[PDB]
Structure 1
């Protein structure tokens, strides 16, 4: 049967318990200690895009030591708006976007405020007509 290999590790974090072999459809959950903040989506899904090999559906998220002083500027996406998360934007906070009518999204819809005061592991999504 199709499987995924060992999930990507996470420094200063934990990965939920999983059985072997890792079957398509398996969901893994990452988390961080109390003084750390998780940056990126917490659950990875074992999927198959070509019906032959298995891959996790996204990169593993990371744990950043908490920086109570960090703050990210308002994330703005022309053609779109926020459907989750609002100011102030602190370390570990997340924002989720949606595109206005007649606009379609490109890229990941959610971003995280990182310790270096910049948004998510990926670039802000874009909205095009």
Structure 2
């Protein structure tokens, strides 16, 4: 059966338990110590596109040293709406979006407020009328 290689490591962070070989369907969780903030989706899933090679479904998140002064402006996604997240958006805070009725999403539904005062680590999702 297809399997995944070692999960992407994380500076100043930890990964939850995983057995080897890593079977397709395996999920691992990332976390950071108290003085750091996890940026990006915390859970990775081992998938396979061709049933021969296994690959993780997304890049690993990262741990950023807490910057207490950082804040992000209200993120806006045309055709979509915020379903989770409250202002003010400080370092490590996240917002989740859903597309309006008759719109379909492309991209990650959640973004995080980074130390550089920008939303990331990915672009905000796009909601397209279908």
Range into which the TM-score falls when normalised by the shorter chain = over 0.9
In the alignment, the residues of structure 1 paired with residue 48 and residue 121 of structure 2 have an alpha-carbon distance, to the nearest angstrom, of 23
Q: For 1:63, what is the secondary structure of its paired residue?
A: strand
Q: Which runs of 5+ in 2 are unaligned?
A: none
Runs of 4+ residues deviating >3 angstroms:
none
Describe the superposition over 1:77-108 as per-residue Cα deviations: whole angstroms up to 9, x where unpaired. 11111001121101000110011112111111
Displacement, 1:41? 0.7
Describe the superposition over 1:110-129 as per-residue Cα deviations: whole angstroms up to 9, x where unpaired. 10000000002100011111
In the alignment, the residues of structure 2 paired with residue 80 and residue 20 of structure 1 have an alpha-carbon distance, to the nearest angstrom, of 40
Structure 2 residue aligned with 1:81:
81
Describe the superposition over 1:24-52 as per-residue Cα deviations: whole angstroms up to 9, x where unpaired. 11111110010000001111011111111
1:21 is the counterpart of 2:21: yes
Q: Which runs of 5+ in 1 are unaligned?
A: none
TM-score, reference length from structure 2: 0.95
In the alignment, the residues of structure 1 paired with residue 51 and residue 20 of structure 2 have an alpha-carbon distance, to the nearest angstrom, of 20
In the alignment, the residues of structure 2 paired with residue 15 and residue 26 of structure 1 have an alpha-carbon distance, to the nearest angstrom, of 13
In the alignment, the residues of structure 1 paired with residue 122 and residue 49 of structure 2 have an alpha-carbon distance, to the nearest angstrom, of 21
In the alignment, the residues of structure 1 paired with residue 106 and residue 19 of structure 2 have an alpha-carbon distance, to the nearest angstrom, of 34
In the alignment, the residues of structure 2 paired with residue 108 and residue 14 of structure 1 have an alpha-carbon distance, to the nearest angstrom, of 23
In the alignment, the residues of structure 1 paired with residue 100 and residue 18 of structure 2 have an alpha-carbon distance, to the nearest angstrom, of 39
More strand by share: 2
